[PDB]
Amino acid sequence: VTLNEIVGLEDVKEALKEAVVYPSKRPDLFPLGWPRGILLYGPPGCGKTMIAAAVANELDSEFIHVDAASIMSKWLGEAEKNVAKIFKTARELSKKENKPAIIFIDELDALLASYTGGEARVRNQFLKEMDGLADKNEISKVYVIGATNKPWRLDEPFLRRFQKRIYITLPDKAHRLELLKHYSSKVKLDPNVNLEELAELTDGYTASDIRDIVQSAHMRVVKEMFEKNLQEPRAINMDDFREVLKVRKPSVNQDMLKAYAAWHEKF
Ligand SMILES: Nc1ncnc2c1ncn2[C@@H]1O[C@H](COP(=O)(O)OP(=O)(O)O)[C@@H](O)[C@H]1O
Structure with a gap:
């Protein structure tokens, strides 16, 4: 909007x-x-x-x-x-x-x-x-x-x-950071979480991708909470992200990026 x-x-x-x-x-x-x-x-x-x-x-x-x-x-x-x-x-x-x-x-x-x-x-x-x-x-x-x-x-x-x-x-390395700050902002992070590092690690990921990462990482603690009948969830820690990154790839492949920059080179 x-x-x-x-x-x-x-x-x-x-x-x-x-x-x-x-x-x-x-x-x-x-x-x-x-x-x-x-x-x-x-x-x-x-x-x-x-x-x-x-x-x-x-x-x-x-x-x-x-x-x-x-x-x-x-x-x-x-x-x-x-x-x-x-x-x-x-x-x-x-x-x-x-x-x-x-x-x-x-x-x-x-x-x-x-x-x-x-x-x-x-x-x-x-x-x-x-x-x-x-x-x-x-x-x-x-x-x-x-x-x-x-x-x-x-x-x-x-x-x-x-x-x-x-x-x-x-989104570039700086912008992915803003994205992460923005999405992550509405959930509880462990202090050990380093958004700068995660921006680096998220090279090649799309803005929606980043959102989905945060959701998915938030999911791990929420899942735990319910499984263990807790009132609030554990904070989201740096591992939580690494775990979700281990399985989530960029939505866009190295070839596509060239397809795009080639197409861009014209027209
Ligand atoms: N530059 C951006 N800033 C903030 N959010 C973004 C940005 N790009 C994508 N998003 C997120 O991803 C979702 C999909 O974006 P969209 O505008 O549909 O792009 P596209 O048309 O390329 O799919 C949005 O609802 C928003 O949450």
């Missing part, structure tokens, strides 16, 4: 401010126009969804969450209906409240995965809608924020509608 709740992504936040907020707030200062389709790409659970909602919140604009997998329906014309409805709703909401409307589409790549054209005809209908967003005469202000963990699955026709493209990265 807010930007300030999002750990890293200081430069992402700025790119979305610059692509969406400042134009919405001051169109008169953008006499050379600006893109309305913004691609967030990266590994899973690193804040593509959060960052999109956080902007919608920053604007207090309407926010419309769609899963691309859900709109691709195996009947001709239901999918078309879906894609038309989305943008229509967006435009109406924008026009009614006189402020922007943000469509967040996650699993975007799923628009290129086959079901029954037909799926091409839906795709092209979507892209037509995209192309329609900047049209000068429309009083509604609609932005599409598209998200995918497999940007490489997007073809050229589809990529050209997304002119702004931000890489949302794994």
Whole structure:
């Protein structure tokens, strides 16, 4: 919900401010126009969804969450209906409240995965809608924020509608620390717990991963409590984490990270 709740992504936040907020707030200062389709790409659970909602919140604009997998329906014309409805709703909401409307589409790549054209005809209908967003005469202000963990699955026709493209990265050593401080903050830690060390040990783990680690480590003492009929749980100690790390790997493999940085190298 807010930007300030999002750990890293200081430069992402700025790119979305610059692509969406400042134009919405001051169109008169953008006499050379600006893109309305913004691609967030990266590994899973690193804040593509959060960052999109956080902007919608920053604007207090309407926010419309769609899963691309859900709109691709195996009947001709239901999918078309879906894609038309989305943008229509967006435009109406924008026009009614006189402020922007943000469509967040996650699993975007799923628009290129086959079901029954037909799926091409839906795709092209979507892209037509995209192309329609900047049209000068429309009083509604609609932005599409598209998200995918497999940007490489997007073809050229589809990529050209997304002119702004931000890489949302794994959390770095410093940021993982903030993440750990943040998640761990609501549970009882042993003094022997060294968050700096754990940040080091969590190289390659996604923000959601980190959350799941903390939960899982909290689970060990809670499990103990109940098993032993105690009133509160034992504190979470440094071992507790090591144990859970022994079995939990990064959600993203060394190849994927290259896939991403390669893809990033273009486009
Ligand atoms: N940068 C971040 N700061 C704080 N929490 C994060 C961050 N990235 C991910 N998370 C956590 O992981 C969950 C999934 O994040 P999400 O925004 O869905 O990213 P993605 O679209 O990449 O899956 C969030 O609900 C949040 O708890």
